[PDB]
Amino acid sequence: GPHMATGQDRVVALVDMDCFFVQVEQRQNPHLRNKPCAVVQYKSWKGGGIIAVSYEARAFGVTRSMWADDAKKLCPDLLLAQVRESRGKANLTKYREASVEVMEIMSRFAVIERASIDEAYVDLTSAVQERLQKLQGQPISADLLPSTYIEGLPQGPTVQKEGMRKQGLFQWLDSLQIDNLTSPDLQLTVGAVIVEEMRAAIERETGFQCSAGISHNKVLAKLACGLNKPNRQTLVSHGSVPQLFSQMPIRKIRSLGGKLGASVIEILGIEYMGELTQFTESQLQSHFGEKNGSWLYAMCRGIEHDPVKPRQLPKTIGCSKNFPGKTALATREQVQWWLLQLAQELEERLTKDRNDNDRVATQLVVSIRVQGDKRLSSLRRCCALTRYDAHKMSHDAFTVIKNCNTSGIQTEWSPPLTMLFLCATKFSAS
DNA sequence: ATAATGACGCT
DNA sequence: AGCGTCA
Ligand SMILES: Cc1cn([C@H]2C[C@H](O)[C@@H](COP(=O)(O)NP(=O)(O)OP(=O)(O)O)O2)c(=O)[nH]c1=O
Ligand SMILES: [Mg+2]
Ligand SMILES: [Mg+2]
């Protein structure tokens, strides 16, 4: 009753760019706008691998990870933009720079946590408090929420989707108690007004469209964001959670899309997130451990405490290249040349980082994958990063891995290497 | 033969 | 430190 926490203490948003790398290429090349379009890396093998897809192309069934030659079979008029290639590898600089454009705009509104190249969580609790003060006790007009969906509405006693959107919004606003500055539903609504403003600013200042979720925590905000992509935002209230979760597959919830989510399903014999409510916290802890158990117990009730961390910048700077199949590296000279290519890209990015962000990386992590091993990494080794010098970094990287080579002939490398990865870590102020 | 990344938990 | 998970 009066002591049961409801997880309604915060207003959190997740803003995610729509088909992000595609929009970056469409801004640059007007010929690609409003067309079925995809971004591809590496053209020679099967036309390249697709890493981003416009919504027009998605309607033909084009997806990420598809080969471009195959995507063209589904969508003969598909247009393609290629990722820049530098020093023999994909170079993602253009998309990193476009990411900064969007992150810097979001940071004007609130503390953000960069969660990927194209999304950030936003803690709007404070911003909402102040806007509520400015807004007297004035009603909130539907005109202030022109792209907002209220999940779960309309309900009760129109055949167009915009008609549906409005009806639900009307029911929501009609029910809202504006006199109470402490109403969680009110707080979420004001949060959504602010996110409309944020999303308009992003589009005005960059040309990029995005979607967003507004709820009381990160997991619900992220889930909400995806419910009405593209170019729309969704409010998921605490009250909407039982119905929303009642048919929500467990794998759709952030962090449950992998092996843990699968074991939840297998061990407990359930399918939907809401079904988790029937287990005691101790029961969930017994199956999945203390941390996962407690997290699941609260999360299936719509409650989560993970804070929006104040971090706009990546914690690591890395670059990697795979060498699949026949191309696996099999000579020492091959290994050294590619370590040099990676180290050169790293130096350039690190030097830029140091100038922009007043920090220096102090540790170098070297990772390789060996032929036959289907793990991401077969081996990780680290050394000190004391100089932003590509030749030193590549030399040092070789030094810490060179003993992996089981070959008798030292000019040869065995087993062949299917991946090289250099990562600069442990930043300190500079 | 998707690739290229990036955060974080466990021991 | 080095490995595993999730995205
Ligand atoms: C998931 C994923 C994304 N990306 C890149 C391309 C995407 O445009 C960008 C953002 O990822 P996303 O938000 O998961 N997908 P999207 O922004 O292209 O499309 P939407 O968010 O579903 O509208 O990151 C990859 O390069 N490999 C990946 O596995
Ligand atoms: Mg996106
Ligand atoms: Mg994203």
Coordinates of C-alpha atoms (C1' of nucleotides) and ligand atoms in Angstrom, one line a residue, chain A residues 16-24 39 41 50-55 58 64-65 83 92 95 116-119 209-211 222 225-226 229-231, chain B residues 2-5, chain C residues 7, ligand 1:
Chain A
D16 CA 17.1 7.3 -31.2
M17 CA 17.9 8.5 -34.7
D18 CA 15.8 7.0 -37.5
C19 CA 17.9 4.9 -40.0
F20 CA 20.8 7.0 -38.9
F21 CA 23.7 6.2 -41.3
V22 CA 21.1 6.4 -44.2
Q23 CA 20.0 9.8 -43.1
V24 CA 23.6 11.0 -42.9
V39 CA 24.3 2.0 -46.5
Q41 CA 30.4 -1.5 -46.4
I50 CA 24.2 -3.7 -45.5
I51 CA 24.5 -1.9 -42.1
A52 CA 21.5 0.6 -42.3
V53 CA 18.2 0.7 -44.2
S54 CA 15.7 3.5 -45.0
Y55 CA 12.1 2.9 -44.1
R58 CA 12.4 -1.9 -45.2
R64 CA 20.8 -5.0 -41.9
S65 CA 23.3 -7.9 -42.4
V83 CA 31.0 3.6 -46.1
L92 CA 33.2 5.5 -39.7
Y95 CA 28.8 9.0 -38.8
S116 CA 25.2 4.3 -28.9
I117 CA 26.4 6.2 -31.9
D118 CA 22.8 7.3 -32.5
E119 CA 21.0 7.4 -29.2
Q209 CA 14.7 12.9 -37.9
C210 CA 14.5 10.7 -34.7
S211 CA 12.1 8.9 -32.5
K222 CA 13.9 2.5 -24.8
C225 CA 10.9 4.6 -28.5
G226 CA 10.6 1.6 -30.8
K229 CA 9.3 4.6 -35.2
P230 CA 9.9 6.4 -37.4
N231 CA 9.6 10.2 -36.7
Chain B
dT2 C1' 28.6 -9.5 -42.0
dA3 C1' 31.6 -5.9 -40.0
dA4 C1' 33.0 -2.5 -36.8
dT5 C1' 32.4 -1.1 -33.0
Chain C
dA7 C1' 23.9 -4.6 -28.5
Ligands
LIG1 C1 22.4 -2.3 -34.7 C2 23.5 -1.8 -35.6 C3 23.6 -0.4 -36.0 N1 24.7 0.0 -36.7 C4 24.8 1.4 -37.1 C5 24.0 1.7 -38.4 C6 22.8 2.4 -37.8 O1 22.2 3.4 -38.7 C7 23.3 3.1 -36.5 C8 22.3 3.2 -35.4 O2 21.8 1.9 -35.1 P1 20.2 1.6 -34.8 O3 19.6 2.8 -34.0 O4 20.1 0.3 -34.1 N2 19.4 1.3 -36.3 P2 19.0 2.7 -37.3 O5 19.2 4.0 -36.6 O6 19.7 2.5 -38.6 O7 17.4 2.5 -37.6 P3 16.2 2.7 -36.5 O8 16.9 3.2 -35.3 O9 15.6 1.4 -36.4 O10 15.3 3.8 -37.2 O11 24.4 2.2 -36.1 C9 25.6 -0.9 -37.2 O12 26.6 -0.5 -37.9 N3 25.6 -2.2 -36.8 C10 24.6 -2.7 -36.1 O13 24.5 -3.9 -35.8

